[PDB]
Amino acid sequence: NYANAQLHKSKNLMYMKAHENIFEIEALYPLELFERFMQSQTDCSIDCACKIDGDELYPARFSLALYNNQYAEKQIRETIDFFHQVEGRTEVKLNYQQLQHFLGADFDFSKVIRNLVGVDARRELADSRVKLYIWMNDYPEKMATAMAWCDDKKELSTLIVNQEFLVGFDFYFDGRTAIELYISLSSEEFQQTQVWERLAKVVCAPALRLVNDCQAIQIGVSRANDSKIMYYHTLNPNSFIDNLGNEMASRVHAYYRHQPVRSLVVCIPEQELTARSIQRLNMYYCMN
Ligand SMILES: [Mg+2]
Numbered sequence: 001n002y003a004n005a006q007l008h009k010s011k012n013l014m015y016m017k018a019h020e021n022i023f024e025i026e027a028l029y030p031l032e033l034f035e036r037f038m039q040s041q042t043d044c045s046i047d048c049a050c051k052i053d054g055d056e057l058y059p060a061r062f063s064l065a066l067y068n069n070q071y072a073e074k075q076i077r078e079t080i081d082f083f084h085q086v087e088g089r090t091e092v093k094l095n096y097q098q099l100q101h102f103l104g105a106d107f108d109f110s111k112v113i114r115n116l117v118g119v120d121a122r123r124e125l126a127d128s129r130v131k132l133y134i135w136m137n138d139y140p141e142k143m144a145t146a147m148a149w150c151d152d153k154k155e156l157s158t159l160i161v162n163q164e165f166l167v168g169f170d171f172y173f174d175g176r177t178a179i180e181l182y183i184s185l186s187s188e189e190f191q192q193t194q195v196w197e198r199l200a201k202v203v204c205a206p207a208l209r210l211v212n213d214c215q216a217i218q219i220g221v222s223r224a225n226d227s228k229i230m231y232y233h234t235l236n237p238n239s240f241i242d243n244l245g246n247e248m249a250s251r252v253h254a255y256y257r258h259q260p261v262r263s264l265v266v267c268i269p270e271q272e273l274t275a276r277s278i279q280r281l282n283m284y285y286c287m288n
Contacts, residue, residue, distance in 0.1 A: 001067070002025035007041040010037060012046045015287045022255060023059035028121035029128070031060060032045055037117070041069050045262075049284040051120070059252075060121035062132070063284070065114060072112035078183040079117050081185070083130050083171060091125060093173040098179045099132065102145065103165065109138040113164065138163040150181035150222050154200040155228070159219065161189050165196045170224070172285045180222035182231070187215050203228070206273035208248045213240055220267075227271040237264035239262050253283070262286045 002008045013035060018024035028031040038044065041064065049061035066075045072183070080096075087094055118131030136142060146167050147157055150237060189195055200208055203219075207230050211217050218231035232241040242268070243254040265284040272278050 001045075002042070007252070008040075008043055009039060012044065012287070015046050015048060019059070019062070023057070025060040025121065028123070029092075029125065030055050030119065030130070031121055031276075033082070034084055034119045035063060037085075038064055040078070041066060045287065045288045049282055050252055052246065052252075052280065053280050055248075057248060057252075058122065061119065061282070063116050063118040063133075063203060069141070070116070076109075076112075079115065079132055082111070082117070083132075086173075087131055088145045088191045092128075092173040094130070094173070094176050095177045096171070099169050099175045099211050102142070102149075102169075102179065107142075107273050108156045108219040111136050111142070111240060113137045126172065128173045130171050131178045132169045132171075134169075134254045135164065135166045138227065139165075142167070146179070146181040149179055150223065152223065153221075155222055156181060156219060159183060159185070159195075159196050161185065161195055166218070168178055168220070170220075176194040178222055178224035180224070181221050182218045182220040184216060184218045190217065201225060203230070204270055204274060207268070207270045210268075212275065213243075218267075225269070227269045229267050229269055230266055230273075234264045234266060237261070240264070241283075244278050244281070246281065249278075249281060249283060256285050257274055260288055262288050276286060 009156065016035060020031060045065040047063040050057055050059035051061060079201060083094055086092055087159060095219045112134055114135035116133035118127045119132065122128040143165050146165060150158060160183045164184060168180040168182065170178040185195065210232060213235055214232045214236050216233040220229040220231065221238055232240065237253070241249055263286045265286065268278060269280055272280050
């Protein structure tokens with residue numbers, strides 16, 4: 001985006017290092033290799049994130065949105081190469097069968113609109129992940145494949161109104177894998193009467209009522225999800241966090257409230273919104 005690519009990358013790394021420093025996670029593998037991977041890219045945008053699970057916090061979470069989909073194929077090659085570099089430590093072994101099966105032998109890289117690369121580093125090495133997200137547009141054969149592999153209940157097929165879809169690949173360091181399908185709805189889209197009526201047949205009421213507080217939502221479905229995951233692109237980050245009644249989320253946002261943030265996305269499993277209190281959620285702070 002910005003003309004001074006090298007200035008912007010310096011700010012990216014400074015955003016990541018801050019996040020690692022406040023949460024005291026900098027030593028987790030493979031964050032240093034991820035930092036180097038960032039710097040090897042032409043330019044990208046960073047999202048710093050934290051996952052909340054009861055009393056536990058998993059804040060070693062970062063995503064890079066790689067600029068210029070003209071080079072989507074090369075980006076995936078260099079991402080895979082970075083995953084192999086992470087596999088440099090002997091007790092880290094990834095399983096690529098889901099990615100390989102999804103791409104097939106003649107993947108149309110001209111259909112990719114955005115690649116994203118992620119990490120969620122854990123104290124328990126076996127639980128850590130690297131992540132690849134492939135954002136696609138107007139690719140009906142791959143969309144149907146993703147729906148068959150991720151949309152058990154055939155619910156996202158009743159909700160989508162654009163040709164874009166996001167396919168996320170999880171690579172656990174002990175060889176576990178998961179694939180996830182995400183679709184998006186802007187405020188303009190989900191405020192249309194028929195679109196909203198379709199939402200209301202698939203999304204439980206407490207999760208649906210939250211959609212109104214948003215400039216956009218995404219919904220992620222996966223065999224590895226215990227319910228649909230709602231991604232709330234918050235209109236007012238401060239009030240959205242306050243309305244969660246979650247002490248740890250308020251503590252996290254207490255720092256970021258006064259930070260130059262492009263947007264705050266909060267994702268909550270549908271099942272959490274039918275409980276007495278929210279205890280599981282992710283917060284993504286997408287930096288400028
Ligand atoms: Mg997921």
